[PDB]
Amino acid sequence: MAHPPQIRIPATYLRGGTSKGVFFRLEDLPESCRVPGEARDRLFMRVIGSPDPYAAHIDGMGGATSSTSKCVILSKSSQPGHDVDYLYGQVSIDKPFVDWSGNCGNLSTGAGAFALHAGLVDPARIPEDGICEVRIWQANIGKTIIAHVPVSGGQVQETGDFELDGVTFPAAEIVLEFLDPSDGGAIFPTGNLVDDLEVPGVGTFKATMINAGIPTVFVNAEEIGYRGTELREEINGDPQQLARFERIRVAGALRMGLIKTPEEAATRQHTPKIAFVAPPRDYRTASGKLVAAGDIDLLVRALSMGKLHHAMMGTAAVAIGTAAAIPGTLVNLAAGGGERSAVRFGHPSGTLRVGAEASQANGEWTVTKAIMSRSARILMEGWVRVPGDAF
Amino acid sequence: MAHPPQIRIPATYLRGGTSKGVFFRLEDLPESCRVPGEARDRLFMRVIGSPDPYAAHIDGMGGATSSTSKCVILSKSSQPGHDVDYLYGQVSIDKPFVDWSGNCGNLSTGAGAFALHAGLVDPARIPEDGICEVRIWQANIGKTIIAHVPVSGGQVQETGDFELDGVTFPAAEIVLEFLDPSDGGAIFPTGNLVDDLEVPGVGTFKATMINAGIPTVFVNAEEIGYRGTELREEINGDPQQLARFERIRVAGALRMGLIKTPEEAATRQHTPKIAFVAPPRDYRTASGKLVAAGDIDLLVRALSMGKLHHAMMGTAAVAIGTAAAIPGTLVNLAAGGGERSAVRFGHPSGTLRVGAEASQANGEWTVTKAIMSRSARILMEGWVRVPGDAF
Numbered sequence: 119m120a121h122p123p124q125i126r127i128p129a130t131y132l133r134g135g136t137s138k139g140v141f142f143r144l145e146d147l148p149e150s151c152r153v154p155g156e157a158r159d160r161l162f163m164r165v166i167g168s169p170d171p172y173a174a175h176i177d178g179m180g181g182a183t184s185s186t187s188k189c190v191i192l193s194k195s196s197q198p199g200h201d202v203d204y205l206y207g208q209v210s211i212d213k214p215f216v217d218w219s220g221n222c223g224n225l226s227t228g229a230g231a232f233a234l235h236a237g238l239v240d241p242a243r244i245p246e247d248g249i250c251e252v253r254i255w256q257a258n259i260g261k262t263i264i265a266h267v268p269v270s271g272g273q274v275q276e277t278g279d280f281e282l283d284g285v286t287f288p289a290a291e292i293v294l295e296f297l298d299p300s301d302g303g304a305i306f307p308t309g310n311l312v313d314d315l316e317v318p319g320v321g322t323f324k325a326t327m328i329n330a331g332i333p334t335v336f337v338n339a340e341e342i343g344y345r346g347t348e349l350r351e352e353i354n355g356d357p358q359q360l361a362r363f364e365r366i367r368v369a370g371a372l373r374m375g376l377i378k379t380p381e382e383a384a385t386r387q388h389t390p391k392i393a394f395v396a397p398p399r400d401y402r403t404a405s406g407k408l409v410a411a412g413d414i415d416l417l418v419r420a421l422s423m424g425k426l427h428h429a430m431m432g433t434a435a436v437a438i439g440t441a442a443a444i445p446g447t448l449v450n451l452a453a454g455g456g457e458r459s460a461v462r463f464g465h466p467s468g469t470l471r472v473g474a475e476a477s478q479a480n481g482e483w484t485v486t487k488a489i490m491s492r493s494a495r496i497l498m499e500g501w502v503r504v505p506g507d508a509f
Numbered sequence: 510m511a512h513p514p515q516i517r518i519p520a521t522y523l524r525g526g527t528s529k530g531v532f533f534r535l536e537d538l539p540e541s542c543r544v545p546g547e548a549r550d551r552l553f554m555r556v557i558g559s560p561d562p563y564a565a566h567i568d569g570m571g572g573a574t575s576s577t578s579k580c581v582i583l584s585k586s587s588q589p590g591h592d593v594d595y596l597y598g599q600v601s602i603d604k605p606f607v608d609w610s611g612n613c614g615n616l617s618t619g620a621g622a623f624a625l626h627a628g629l630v631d632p633a634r635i636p637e638d639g640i641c642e643v644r645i646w647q648a649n650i651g652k653t654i655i656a657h658v659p660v661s662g663g664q665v666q667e668t669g670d671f672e673l674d675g676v677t678f679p680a681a682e683i684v685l686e687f688l689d690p691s692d693g694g695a696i697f698p699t700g701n702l703v704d705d706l707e708v709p710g711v712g713t714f715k716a717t718m719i720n721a722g723i724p725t726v727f728v729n730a731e732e733i734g735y736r737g738t739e740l741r742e743e744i745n746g747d748p749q750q751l752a753r754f755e756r757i758r759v760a761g762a763l764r765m766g767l768i769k770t771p772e773e774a775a776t777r778q779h780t781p782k783i784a785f786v787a788p789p790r791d792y793r794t795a796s797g798k799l800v801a802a803g804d805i806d807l808l809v810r811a812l813s814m815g816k817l818h819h820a821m822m823g824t825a826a827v828a829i830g831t832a833a834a835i836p837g838t839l840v841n842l843a844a845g846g847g848e849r850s851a852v853r854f855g856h857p858s859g860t861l862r863v864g865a866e867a868s869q870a871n872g873e874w875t876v877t878k879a880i881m882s883r884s885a886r887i888l889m890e891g892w893v894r895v896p897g898d899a900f
């Protein structure tokens with residue numbers, strides 16, 4: 119017949135962190151799609167509803183945003199010491215293209231949960247009640263992610279009271295550890311944990327300039343004239359303040375070797391970031407919610423693209439966690455000094471717990487872990503349908 | 510336990526026309542949700558991922574647009590001469606509200622298909638191969654919709670080569686008939702099928718002013734200086750042309766009693782619409798595709814909000830079909846006159862087949878049917894999950 123029925127493909131549609139994706143077990147895919155290739159790419163384009171000239175994904179599982187135009191394959195890992203191989207495809211909205219070159223750290227959370235819903239983890243590793251350490255081989259980039267997935271009654275504990283910025287409703291916390299994570303080069307491009315940063319016409323300030331997550335210039339709130347508790351309204355409305363921060367950011371860029379000249383910074387607004395830190399202090403948000411000093415290890419405020427950020431940027435959260443873990447940095451010192459392999463920092467809209475491990479050898483630091491918390495949940499499970507001739 | 514597992518609710522996620530919705534059988538809903546009420550509303554808010562302050566529906570089935578924030582309940586009809594009752598809930602994105610007062614004609618297409626996937630139609634009515642006449646009681650507004658759903662092998666024929674504007678991929682055609690469809694009042698507010706419309710400083714033109722679908726002023730292309738084949742670029746770049754059309758539109762508004770004064774039209778830009786018609790003629794689109802005169806019954810071009818529309822507005826498509834069916838209107842005459850209970854018209858980007866039936870009694874016309882074609886397909890089927898405490 120000219121128009122056979124659609125194919126039904128077992129799938130699970132999950133929220134993983136602040137993204138949605140359609141998840142497949144490798145064995146559930148059509149035979150032609152069980153290796154990488156054009157069939158697989160076509161299949162996922164079609165599941166998602168791409169390429170779409172209307173840019174709306176009305177005819178597929180996509181939501182017409184980068185956060186909602188994603189497919190994931192999990193399989194039992196061939197890689198020693200791992201439970202699952204995790205492959206992530208970013209489906210272009212308007213072009214026929216599936217990009218396999220990246221990772222989605224948000225969908226990693228979903229990979230750990232799905233590994234268990236999918237039956238891909240050795241049951242010797244799954245408690246009746248507790249935590250399952252799901253060992254994920256990120257197959258796109260060749261790196262390990264450990265997802266500590268809570269379990270009740272032998273099944274993933276999905277529900278709970280853990281809040282994640284950008285996730286409307288609270289759910290159960292899944293802690294992720296990115297092992298040996300990888301603008302490359304030295305963690306401390308100046309070779310020092312703290313430098314005297316000269317900012318022409320502004321001052322000379324202590325600063326930690328760190329390349330971890332994202333190149334970031336950190337300074338002490340107090341020294342640059344801030345309390346560390348400031349919210350967006352008291353900064354983002356004063357161009358004089360904002361211009362001053364940019365001067366510090368440019369000075370650090372120069373000192374970090376990210377630009378050769380200060381005018382080069384006009385056209386390099388994304389990195390480095392600029393943030394200021396302080397020891398903990400009670401403060402209230404713009405919303406009205408109180409954060410007590412006892413509840414946090416330090417305060418951090420960061421600017422992105424010339425404005426104070428409302429919470430914290432993802433890669434900058436990694437820079438904080440990394441800097442906190444390395445004793446002697448301004449972030450470490452703000453958090454109390456000594457060992458700080460996990461810290462909870464207060465940002466304008468709430469608090470965030472991050473962590474890191476790092477080691478030293480001939481002055482030279484290596485980051486061995488990035489640690490963060492996210493959540494995941496199943497939205498729908500069953501089968502996706504596509505036309506059989508579409509791939 | 511403090512956080513029980515999510516509930517799994519049997520559901521089907523379908524595209525119906527140019528919308529997506531989550532479809533339920535009434536019997537599959539939790540007991541508390543099998544009558545209208547707060548539980549049901551909460552359930553659907555939660556399935557969709559509302560209310561969402563981020564306006565992104567990352568934590569639900571919604572797509573954060575009005576077209577993708579919809580839930581549907583079908584049940585076996587209690588209403589004599591009907592197969593299913595069809596209830597549609599529009600879920601607000603940012604407020605906790607489900608609106609049950611409207612219909613979605615696009616999701617009607619999905620209602621007819623789902624009625625069959627859901628097993629809700631008497632099998633005496635379903636062929637092995639042919640068409641199933643699904644008789645839908647639109648429970649929100651109290652009206653009948655007949656969906657002619659194609660069937661192969663005793664199952665809905667979903668796939669096919671029928672194109673619908675706003676639907677990325679072709680699928681099988683489902684013809685819908687809206688029985689006794691219902692700015693109300695007379696179909697012809699002037700009492701005439703054609704009037705002499707005086708447009709100050711522009712001219713006096715034949716016009717059909719019809720209230721069906723939407724109040725529309727129709728004129729003959731030739732008389733107002735157009736060929737009827739014009740595309741957007743040759744009109745939408747000339748303010749003098751656009752101002753002239755608006756004068757005609759205002760003249761018709763006045764004559765239709767929709768405004769008391771011409772200045773009132775400055776703040777009433779949505780109705781009436783203004784369109785011009787012509788007998789069929791070959792033309793090429795901006796894309797480059799040729800439409801032959803033999804393939805169409807007439808040409809129609811409409812303006813909305815002061816600009817030539819790229820195809821045709823939904824409610825204006827109904828006005829065309831209705832006017833075509835009523836012998837003596839300019840639309841009927843453009844289409845060849847006589848009986849025209851279905852017509853295919855050529856618009857700037859393609860062609861559209863619409864239909865109507867109407868009857869006359871003491872000069873007074875009543876529309877008994879609106880007929881149009883759409884398509885539907887299942888995107889995913891199985892179960893949605895929500896937290897059990899969410900509703």
Ligand SMILES: [Cl-]
Nearest residue numbers: 148149150151
């Ligand atoms: Cl195959």
Ligand SMILES: [Cl-]
Nearest residue numbers: 144145193194
């Ligand atoms: Cl496998």
Ligand SMILES: [Cl-]
Nearest residue numbers: 539540541542
């Ligand atoms: Cl219940």
Ligand SMILES: [Cl-]
Nearest residue numbers: 535536584585
């Ligand atoms: Cl029922």
Ligand SMILES: [Co+2]
Nearest residue numbers: 278279288512
């Ligand atoms: Co709770």
Ligand SMILES: [Co+2]
Nearest residue numbers: 121669670679
């Ligand atoms: Co085809």
